[PDB]
Design a protein around this motif. Structure first.
Motif, mmCIF file in Angstrom:
data_model
loop_
_atom_site.group_PDB
_atom_site.id
_atom_site.type_symbol
_atom_site.label_atom_id
_atom_site.label_comp_id
_atom_site.label_asym_id
_atom_site.label_seq_id
_atom_site.Cartn_x
_atom_site.Cartn_y
_atom_site.Cartn_z
ATOM 1 N N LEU B 150 -45.491 -13.121 22.053
ATOM 2 C CA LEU B 150 -45.346 -11.884 21.296
ATOM 3 C C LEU B 150 -43.891 -11.420 21.269
ATOM 4 O O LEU B 150 -43.390 -11.017 20.232
ATOM 5 N N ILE B 151 -43.229 -11.461 22.413
ATOM 6 C CA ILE B 151 -41.825 -11.004 22.509
ATOM 7 C C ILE B 151 -40.903 -11.886 21.653
ATOM 8 O O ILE B 151 -40.084 -11.392 20.870
ATOM 9 N N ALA B 201 -41.780 -1.298 21.496
ATOM 10 C CA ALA B 201 -41.865 -0.173 20.551
ATOM 11 C C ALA B 201 -40.570 0.630 20.680
ATOM 12 O O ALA B 201 -40.000 1.076 19.686
ATOM 13 N N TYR B 202 -40.100 0.762 21.906
ATOM 14 C CA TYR B 202 -38.831 1.397 22.176
ATOM 15 C C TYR B 202 -37.682 0.693 21.465
ATOM 16 O O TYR B 202 -37.020 1.313 20.645
ATOM 17 N N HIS B 203 -37.449 -0.582 21.790
ATOM 18 C CA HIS B 203 -36.293 -1.330 21.266
ATOM 19 C C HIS B 203 -36.375 -1.450 19.728
ATOM 20 O O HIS B 203 -35.403 -1.166 19.020
ATOM 21 N N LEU D 132 -36.707 -7.566 24.802
ATOM 22 C CA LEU D 132 -36.477 -8.300 23.555
ATOM 23 C C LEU D 132 -35.494 -9.478 23.708
ATOM 24 O O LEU D 132 -35.641 -10.511 23.049
ATOM 25 N N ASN D 133 -34.502 -9.331 24.583
ATOM 26 C CA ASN D 133 -33.487 -10.373 24.792
ATOM 27 C C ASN D 133 -33.731 -11.314 25.968
ATOM 28 O O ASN D 133 -32.910 -12.194 26.243
ATOM 29 N N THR D 134 -34.847 -11.119 26.673
ATOM 30 C CA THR D 134 -35.267 -12.016 27.758
ATOM 31 C C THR D 134 -35.778 -13.383 27.235
ATOM 32 O O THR D 134 -36.549 -13.447 26.292
ATOM 33 N N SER D 135 -35.317 -14.468 27.837
ATOM 34 C CA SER D 135 -35.760 -15.812 27.447
ATOM 35 C C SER D 135 -37.132 -16.115 28.057
ATOM 36 O O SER D 135 -37.572 -15.395 28.965
ATOM 37 N N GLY D 183 -35.211 -4.489 32.909
ATOM 38 C CA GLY D 183 -35.318 -5.611 32.009
ATOM 39 C C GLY D 183 -35.874 -6.871 32.609
ATOM 40 O O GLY D 183 -36.405 -6.862 33.683
ATOM 41 N N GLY D 184 -35.752 -7.965 31.885
ATOM 42 C CA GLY D 184 -36.076 -9.264 32.417
ATOM 43 C C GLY D 184 -37.529 -9.616 32.450
ATOM 44 O O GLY D 184 -37.870 -10.673 32.947
#
Ligand SMILES: NC(=O)c1ccc[n+]([C@@H]2O[C@H](COP(=O)([O-])OP(=O)(O)OC[C@H]3O[C@@H](n4cnc5c(N)ncnc54)[C@H](O)[C@@H]3O)[C@@H](O)[C@H]2O)c1
Ligand SMILES: NC(=O)c1ccc[n+]([C@@H]2O[C@H](COP(=O)([O-])OP(=O)(O)OC[C@H]3O[C@@H](n4cnc5c(N)ncnc54)[C@H](O)[C@@H]3O)[C@@H](O)[C@H]2O)c1
Ligand SMILES: NC(=O)c1ccc[n+]([C@@H]2O[C@H](COP(=O)([O-])OP(=O)(O)OC[C@H]3O[C@@H](n4cnc5c(N)ncnc54)[C@H](O)[C@@H]3O)[C@@H](O)[C@H]2O)c1
Ligand SMILES: NC(=O)c1ccc[n+]([C@@H]2O[C@H](COP(=O)([O-])OP(=O)(O)OC[C@H]3O[C@@H](n4cnc5c(N)ncnc54)[C@H](O)[C@@H]3O)[C@@H](O)[C@H]2O)c1
Ligand SMILES: OCc1ccc(Oc2ccc(Cl)cc2Cl)c(O)c1
Ligand SMILES: OCc1ccc(Oc2ccc(Cl)cc2Cl)c(O)c1
Ligand SMILES: OCc1ccc(Oc2ccc(Cl)cc2Cl)c(O)c1
Ligand SMILES: OCc1ccc(Oc2ccc(Cl)cc2Cl)c(O)c1
Lengths: 287, 287, 287, 287
Positions: B150-151, B201-203, D132-135, D183-184
């Motif tokens: 999903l991400i 939803a935030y980002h 969103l930027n996590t691999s 994050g992460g």
């Protein structure tokens, strides 16, 4: 074709009741207004005088179709429930059949069975005091007018609704998380309401196949919001600054959701609290 | 028009993906299917041999319209992630551009920017084992395919989507309450999915003005549901007996909710878990 | 050494109030009973007659130390609040100083400042009717006696408590999930209470450094439970069959938790609903 | 006595692990530390050089007692999971029996069955990147180490524990509400942990009569907290200003709650997320 919605809690066009009326109108739902007696005549006057003409425009094609406008007081379940002080009151003495049962009867007698019901009203005499300083009389008043009124409305209106009808009310996240200025037992009233929405969903769903849900709206600068202790100016600024969606929340934003939940499209949704608040409820830490 | 939806997770006409497709079609949304390579060929042959013709009938006034069918594997983010063995595998050798990035680029090259995205997929090697007996590999597999996907879909598709786009995924209540039989770290995966839905939803809301929500669906007898072992007949029977609404839960019931959340009519809803399960989730004790 | 707890809501030894009293006793907390006037004299009689001697045994070392036993009615905030029918009533006419303010004053006048407060009481005249058939009078009664009574008790007792004091009440999961026989607005009352626990935590924590939490207990066969419509026999059987921990829930199980939350050990916990129910609340599907 | 606790996740005296150890020591519980190999040697030298002597002081009446210190890596379930590179790594070459299974067997051989287990660890290679930027690798790493490790500890330690044993882990509210900076896939991991806590309460309660709960702690300036980048000073400052209880959150505040949940006094609590955060979680809008 043949949909009728009673909206309980319209005083003017700056509230969520109006926004709900507007969106339903887009679907050609016949609208009936339940208007609190103290503000009935003023509302009627403003309407007659064209004060709302611009607010009734849906678009190029059409104007909002208001079937009827009726005085409605959620304080009273039946004719027997009105006391002398109210009977003898300037604004009430000149009206009748404004208790919850009378309104149900009168609508049924005029237009038949309906299939959409909206609770969009709250009150609390002591809203400006914090919970800890709220009296018994003040607390119970808030619950009576803001929460019990939902149950009563269901008890009386289900007799005049079609199978597969749908019901909604409006709530606020202060039931779940602490909002300092939201006093007088309004937080309490809203907590009872969201829970009552579940219990009602059980009874109405099993016994009548009727759905009920509640919409947890973000802040809108309406009459009643202005009564709370700038509070509403703060709420709106904060929301627009910190919500995931940085957009002005409109009453029609809630209206478009109300409309969906009152339609057959949401046939499988019941007993739910649906957040319509630009996502604000998901945040922990402001950023 | 200009409404295009990519639905990721379709193998046949028995799942929620098909139900979402049918409902979106009713609103004249262009549909693009993303099909896992292990079942892509069997899907295409059935389609070409007109095996789905019956299932594509909407009103008898109308019939489903499918813009495109694409091989898609949500395990792989980019071409460089594909392991030598998979790329040479009998079912993959013949297919190309099936990673998340390549499918994004492909769709963009062929049709431009889209405004609707559906994640309708899950997998878990060890779903048959209870949580305590799930291995590290199995658990990570479940999270990788059912949640991380999903991400990743978001990261790559946000470049080919317009502002005010909407994204939905599907989840199950076993994330919040215990469902024996829902093994393999599937419960774990759905809990992460439901939390990631808020974080995204935030980002997505702040940076792109894009909404994301998840639907917590009740039991449907899909292909994947039977693979759990029986478990699903039990879930269905229980739901139809104890839910507030005692009616058969249909895939199109989820479809119409999905369709609402994907349209502009749910402009102010984001980061939510919306339950479409005949209200079963609200119950504590059966009767 | 020097801890005093007022327990509001003891009629006999089969309830949670007694179980809380017992566990607190293990810590040498001085106990004061608030007993509802209708059952005051009978309680006093039973005590004098040694009916509770066995139930007062803590272990080899000691017997429960009851500092005092006082009539207490949560219906009335102050002396002014009592009506003629109650003043003239068989059981009340022979007692005095049993309103919430009078009890606070009287305790303070006799023993000084206290540091532990327990709300362990509820009532609802219409508990045997479902929510939809509950009257306004019935609903508000449940909220008045089961929820507002908590706020009142805090308002009046905070004047007579030490900084760092602690307060608890008892709730039930019917506020959050639908329990069919839990009628008369008890579900509603409990919903308000859990929310009020949050709001109170804010005010009492910021203004007085006092904590308040609520315990959501599993089923116990007490006086009041027996008043609900076998319901309690069902609840207990189900719980013992389906809860994660298949053990008999005891009032002292709740008491040991109440004791911890009322101690300094839980210095960092406030505004919480703590489940003490052998984990039952976590289950979705019975297995 | 015969109370032995294994605490997994200690590197120094600045984290919640130390605070849990100190509080357990106060109750005469035997403490065994499980220390990640990258910091094991530095931990031992400091200890031997009496660098922690000050930090081990309880009352000035009493001083902490530590039964044993063991190298422990929650990445590895069994000896067969250890990759050639790790086993030959400078920090691992010298150590033995550090997998989850080997540490279980070791403890059992040396001290017999234990009754208390603490998971107090988390890791994420990509914690500095937003979700969103996590691999894929980063996300799976976070779940593997922070969540799966809990399930694995359970699977292997349940064989060396007595019935009525208790297990706790630590979590953070970012699982339920959005915390930018967390994050992460750490939020993802904590959401899975909190769901797995329920699922495991089911299996462990029914099959072994063993309890499991999780504590959602407020901000503490630990070693790991600083690695997030500053983020933690912000969190602390915010918490001390806006929490219902405006006092500094200490590691031992969590310790005493952990100690209660590990003792027989919380016999009826299982599968819960218990918040120990000065009540911050209950707030919506700041002042
Ligand atoms: N405005 C907001 O920010 C906001 C946020 C969340 C929820 N809500 C909810 O939305 C609903 C609608 O209120 P609004 O915000 O549109 O303001 P509003 O003033 O437009 O609506 C409230 C209406 O309730 C009516 N009312 C009050 N007491 C009544 C009684 N005893 N009987 C019948 N009617 C009575 C008033 O006449 C008024 O028209 C309320 O339930 C409110 O709690 C509002
Ligand atoms: N059916 C139910 O009762 C139910 C209840 C709640 C939620 N859901 C959810 O609905 C979604 C769809 O499941 P369903 O019940 O429709 O069964 P389904 O088999 O119809 O849907 C699953 C689809 O995902 C595809 N898929 C699996 N792994 C994939 C990968 N790596 N890449 C691309 N595609 C992949 C499969 O080919 C399959 O077509 C799932 O997320 C499931 O968790 C289903
Ligand atoms: N028993 C259960 O299964 C259960 C489960 C969850 C919660 N609870 C809660 O635990 C609390 C204690 O009740 P219990 O279950 O021990 O039964 P109980 O009958 O022992 O306790 C209830 C007490 O409240 C008192 N009371 C009623 N009205 C009062 C008033 N107006 N003023 C003062 N006192 C009044 C009664 O005298 C009675 O002693 C209640 O709040 C109940 O809601 C009970
Ligand atoms: N400090 C806070 O603000 C806070 C708030 C909520 C939750 N927590 C939680 O508390 C727990 C402990 O963190 P902390 O804040 O005390 O920082 P900490 O550094 O004191 O604790 C983390 C410990 O885990 C160990 N560890 C990391 N990976 C490991 C592995 N693979 N095997 C064995 N051990 C490993 C580290 O050596 C370290 O000693 C974490 O689960 C964290 O999520 C902390
Ligand atoms: O922005 C939050 C907010 C604003 C207004 C609201 O509506 C009322 C609030 C108090 C009272 Cl007495 C009556 C009503 Cl209709 C509300 O519920 C929440
Ligand atoms: O009725 C409840 C239910 C049935 C099926 C489900 O979907 C899956 C379950 C397991 C796996 Cl491995 C894959 C998928 Cl698509 C699901 O999420 C929930
Ligand atoms: O097993 C569930 C359960 C049993 C008893 C309870 O207590 C009461 C219930 C109704 C009324 Cl009128 C008064 C009280 Cl003290 C309760 O809250 C929940
Ligand atoms: O103040 C909130 C907070 C601070 C620290 C935390 O612990 C970690 C955070 C990230 C990583 Cl990689 C590892 C750990 Cl132990 C945590 O969970 C929550």
């Amino acid at each position: 074709n043949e949909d009728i919605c009673f909206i309980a809690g319209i005083g003017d066009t700056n509230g969520y009741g109006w926004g709900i009326a507007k969106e339903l109108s887009k679907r050609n739902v016949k609208i009936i207004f339940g208007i609190w007696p103290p503000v009935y005549n003023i509302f009627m006057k403003n309407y007659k005088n064209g004060k709302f003409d611009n607010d009734m425009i849906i678009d190029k094609d059409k104007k909002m179709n208001i079937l009827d406008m009726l005085p409605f007081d959620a304080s009273f379940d039946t004719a027997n429930d009105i006391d002398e002080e109210t009977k003898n009151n300037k604004r009430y003495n000149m009206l009748q059949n404004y208790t919850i049962e009378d309104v149900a009867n009168l609508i049924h007698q005029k237009y038949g069975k309906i299939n959409m019901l909206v609770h969009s009203l709250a009150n609390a005499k002591e809203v400006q005091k914090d919970l800890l300083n709220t009296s018994r009389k003040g607390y119970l008043d808030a619950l009576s007018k803001s929460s019990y009124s939902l149950i009563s409305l269901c008890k009386y209106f289900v007799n005049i609704m079609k199978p597969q009808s749908s019901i909604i009310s409006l709530t606020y996240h202060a039931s779940q998380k602490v909002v300092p200025g939201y006093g007088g037992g309004m937080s309490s009233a809203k907590a009872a309401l969201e829970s009552d929405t579940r219990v009602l969903a059980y009874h109405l769903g099993r016994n009548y196949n009727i759905r009920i849900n509640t919409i947890s709206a973000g802040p809108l600068k309406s009459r009643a919001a202005t009564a709370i202790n700038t509070f509403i100016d703060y709420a709106i600024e904060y929301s627009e600054k910190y919500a995931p969606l940085r957009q002005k929340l409109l009453s029609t934003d809630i209206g478009s959701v109300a409309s969906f939940l009152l339609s057959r499209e949401s046939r499988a949704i019941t007993g739910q609290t649906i957040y319509v608040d630009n996502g604000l409820n998901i945040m922990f830490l402001p950023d």
